[PDB]
Design a protein around this ligand. Structure first.
Ligand SMILES: Cc1cc2nc3c(=O)[nH]c(=O)nc-3n(C[C@H](O)[C@H](O)[C@H](O)COP(=O)(O)OP(=O)(O)OC[C@H]3O[C@@H](n4cnc5c(N)ncnc54)[C@H](O)[C@@H]3O)c2cc1C
Length: 251
């Protein structure tokens, strides 16, 4: 049943975990895309859900970053997955969070809350991002410090990696914030873009449609709020068939 085997699991909190799985031979994707994964219910019927692939396209192993919803049909079960066990993975990638769906530009922004960092876990490790852009800005906002941990460790490890670390050097700017716990930088993405705080903090020019391209991943509310701010700076939604300055993915 499109089965793949789990090779690693890390629990970040009781409501957040990541895992790696073997890669289907026929899967060809672009960093930022998503696929469907799942498990069988009591009656043998698949419980299938859209998931961003959190590993870059070049990686022979796949990574996922998952919520656990206590009464959620999939994740109430998926949270208990172990190394050596199998998941269903349909190798049909889709999604608009891909570099091909943006006009060429100079700065690339990843704007994520919660598990929305997942496609950017992929793209931050994608050579094409650093080939096609001079700066890559990762804004990740969560309520609590523990919710940032998967991403903070990902960025530490990629910065230390002799291959990826070299590609991202002087290009990747990582801007994690919390909104409900004290942390070195705080505040919503919407608010820190609108006030210009992120520009002040990183010491970079304000957002403009000539140079900036952006990708958004998170809840419906998050996307709605962030889109309004992007539009306030003159950036337009495109995806493809007609690429423009930003793309969004809402769940
Ligand atoms: C394009 C796309 C990409 C996705 N990528 C991811 C991903 O990388 N990681 C991930 O954990 N989920 C992701 N999701 C959500 C995922 O498809 C499922 O909803 C999730 O696995 C929960 O499944 P469930 O059956 O346990 O609960 P569901 O019945 O699917 O959802 C129950 C409730 O929990 C909320 N909820 C579900 N998922 C999340 C979440 N991730 N964060 C906050 N609230 C949530 C829902 O809004 C809903 O109210 C993605 C969804 C879309 C459409």
């Amino acid at each position: 049943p499109d089965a793949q085997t789990v090779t690693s699991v890390r629990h970040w909190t009781d409501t957040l975990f990541s895992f790696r799985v073997t890669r289907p031979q026929t899967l060809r994707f672009r960093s930022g895309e998503f696929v469907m994964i799942g498990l069988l219910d009591d009656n043998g019927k698949p419980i299938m859900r859209a998931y961003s692939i959190a590993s870059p396209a070049w990686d022979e192993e796949l990574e996922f970053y998952s919520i656990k919803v206590p009464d959620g049909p999939l994740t109430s079960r998926l949270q208990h997955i172990k190394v050596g066990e199998q998941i269903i993975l349909r190798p049909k990638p889709v999604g608009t969070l891909v570099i091909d769906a943006l006009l060429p530009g100079k700065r690339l922004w990843f704007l994520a809350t919660g598990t929305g960092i997942a496609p950017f876990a992929s793209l931050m490790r994608e050579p094409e991002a650093y080939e096609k852009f001079d700066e890559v800005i990762m804004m990740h906002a969560c309520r609590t410090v523990a919710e940032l941990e998967y991403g903070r460790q990902l960025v530490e490890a990629l910065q230390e990696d002799p291959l990826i670390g070299e590609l991202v050097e002087g290009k990747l700017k990582y801007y994690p914030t919390t909104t409900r716990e004290e942390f070195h930088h705080m505040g919503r993405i919407t608010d820190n873009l609108a006030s210009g705080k992120v520009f002040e903090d990183l010491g970079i020019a304000p957002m403009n449609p000539e140079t900036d391209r952006a990708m958004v991943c998170g809840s419906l509310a998050f996307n709605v709020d962030v889109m309004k701010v992007l539009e306030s700076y003159g950036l337009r939604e495109g995806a493809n068939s007609e690429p423009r300055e930003f793309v969004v993915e809402k769940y």
